[PDB]
Design a protein around this ligand. Structure first.
Ligand code: SAM
Length: 311
């Protein structure tokens, strides 16, 4: 788990306090919080069934403390209200964004470039069987739409040629597997551009990394989810409570940053139907009183920790 010591330090859990871990994952951070101070109450949320079941298991060892919840950031306000949690309650809220170890290390879920699997990439697992997969997306969207997703969400300078390769490839055989898609991405580049470039095979610099990241953000609606989750975090924090967020990508970091600065960002309800249908989101992009005390910004890894005290 990322920056566990710093997370627990920034949260500073004390006796009698109440916490929300919005990204329970494998439970790494929640367990570290409990080891620091066990006389707490902690709501453990995740959109992934696999993570939620680990939170339920943990609640069997810590029945006084843990309340496990299955849901998206966008569902968290409803979940908390139905659980009786009032606004202004939490001493701390944690958001460790992105993928869990379970999502990355289970080839069948289709998140990673190491091992081949179905091009699934849905964080919700089997919860929403009609939720579009990454395979659905690359097989259905026209060339301009795919290029826009890669450019906007992946910040992929080569979005057009990669999109062109995807559309050419799918006309031969549908794109259904992660390594199949990675090979298609690499195929967009002439040999002289990539020959003997071992970095383009390395874990975090793989030639298909940005493409996979763009598809993950789109498939899981991560930018709108994040903004909604941050607003919910602020509403349910009490004054003096701490928000701690870990970002790993330029767009989500910019969203957290602007949120903590009190800068307004795009609400979908303010976009015309045409805009919501035909354009990619500008959340986190360059040209899209005091509520916080900003108490930490630290980096390791793409990791960036931002912590703030609600005023
Ligand atoms: C980086 S892992 C968190 C790891 C965790 N802190 C630990 O120690 O194991 C991110 C988790 O947040 C969840 N997640 C990502 N976006 C979400 C969203 N919009 N709503 C609810 N859960 C989300 C993922 O399913 C994943 O389990």
């Amino acid at each position: 788990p990322v920056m566990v010591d710093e997370v627990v330090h920034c949260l500073s859990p004390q006796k009698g306090q109440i916490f929300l871990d919005m990204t329970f994952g494998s439970g790494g951070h929640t367990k570290a919080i409990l080891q620091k101070e066990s006389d707490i109450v902690l709501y453990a949320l995740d959109r992934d069934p696999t993570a939620y079941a680990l939170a339920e298991h943990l609640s069997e060892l810590y029945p006084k403390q843990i309340r496990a919840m299955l849901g998206q950031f966008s569902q968290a306000e409803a979940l908390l209200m139905k659980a009786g949690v009032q606004p202004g309650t939490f001493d701390g809220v944690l958001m460790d964004l992105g993928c869990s170890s379970m999502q990355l290390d289970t080839p069948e879920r289709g998140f990673s470039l190491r091992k081949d699997g179905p091009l699934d990439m849905r964080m919700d697992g089997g919860r929403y069987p009609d939720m579009p997969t990454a395979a659905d997306v690359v097989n259905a969207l026209d060339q301009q739409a795919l290029a826009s997703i890669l450019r906007t969400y992946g910040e992929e300078k080569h979005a057009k040629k990669i999109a062109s390769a995807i559309v050419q490839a799918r006309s031969i055989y549908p794109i259904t597997r992660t390594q199949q898609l990675a090979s298609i991405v690499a195929g967009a580049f002439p040999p002289s551009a990539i020959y003997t470039r071992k970095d383009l095979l390395q874990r975090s610099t793989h030639i298909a990394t940005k493409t996979f990241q763009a598809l993950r953000i789109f498939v899981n609606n991560e930018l709108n989810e994040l903004y909604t989750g941050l607003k919910t975090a602020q509403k349910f924090l009490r004054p003096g409570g701490r928000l701690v967020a870990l970002s790993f990508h330029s767009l989500e970091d910019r969203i957290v940053k602007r949120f903590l600065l009190g800068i307004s960002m795009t609400e979908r309800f303010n976009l015309s139907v045409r805009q919501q249908v035909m354009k990619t989101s500008q959340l986190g992009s360059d040209h899209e009183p005091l509520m916080w005390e900003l108490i930490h910004k630290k980096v390791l890894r793409s990791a960036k920790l931002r912590a703030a005290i609600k005023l």
